[PDB]
């Protein structure tokens, strides 16, 4: 029916793969009110 046998072995053949971490992360899902003002702040930045 079911078993986890050998599944950890399969995962470790090429894993465990950590996601690539970049200096800047996506802003999707953050507070739109904060994001909208930040866009205006960069627009008038000088």
């Amino acid at each position: 029916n079911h078993t986890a046998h050998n599944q950890s072995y399969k995962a470790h053949r090429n894993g465990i793969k950590k996601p690539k971490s970049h200096r800047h992360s996506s802003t999707k899902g953050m507070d739109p009110k904060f994001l909208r003002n930040q866009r205006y702040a960069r627009k008038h930045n000088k």
């Binding site: 465990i16 950590k18 996601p19 899902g29 507070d31």
Partner: protein
């Protein structure tokens, strides 16, 4: 779904501590959360809104968003051969500020001054910590020696308090 509800197997994990029920102390609501801070997720059983899934209970994550009543938290989750960066929003009642990096900031300053002091005198050093190493030799003053020997066996003593 698919044979298990959202809060299945949470009889103990989501229950309040003994004699620690009722009103939540207000220091919880006076905490300040900033982007990049580390927080430990601890579900409070009394607050039923914004509560994370049982998996995230007892996990430490990084704050990536702040809302009126909740903080966005990034938690690593291992799925087969990959680690996923799970982004969840949690009400601040379920999060505690973690002390996992409490020693970092103070350590950096001490390292900076030690290098600065060594730089002025032209002596290259290393500020790295080291694990416990072997102890040096030393002398111990003699004292009365207590002799330890095996005890004769007694069946009557093979029970807490004896028979």
């Amino acid at each position: 779904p698919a044979g298990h509800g959202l809060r299945s197997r949470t009889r103990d994990s989501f229950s309040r501590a003994f004699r620690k029920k009722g009103t939540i102390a207000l220091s919880t609501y006076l905490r300040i959360f900033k982007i990049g801070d580390y927080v430990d997720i601890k579900v409070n059983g009394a607050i039923h809104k914004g509560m994370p899934h049982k998996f995230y209970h007892g996990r430490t994550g990084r704050v990536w968003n702040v809302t009126k009543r909740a903080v966005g938290v990034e938690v690593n989750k291992q799925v087969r051969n990959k680690i996923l960066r799970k982004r969840i929003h949690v009400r601040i009642e379920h999060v505690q500020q973690s002390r996992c990096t409490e020693e970092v900031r103070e350590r950096i300053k001490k390292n900076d001054q030690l290098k600065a002091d060594a730089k002025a005198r032209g002596e290259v050093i290393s500020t790295k910590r080291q694990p416990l190493g072997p102890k040096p030799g030393f002398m111990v003053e003699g004292a009365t020696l207590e002799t330890v020997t095996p005890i004769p066996y007694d069946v009557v003593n093979d029970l807490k308090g004896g028979y």
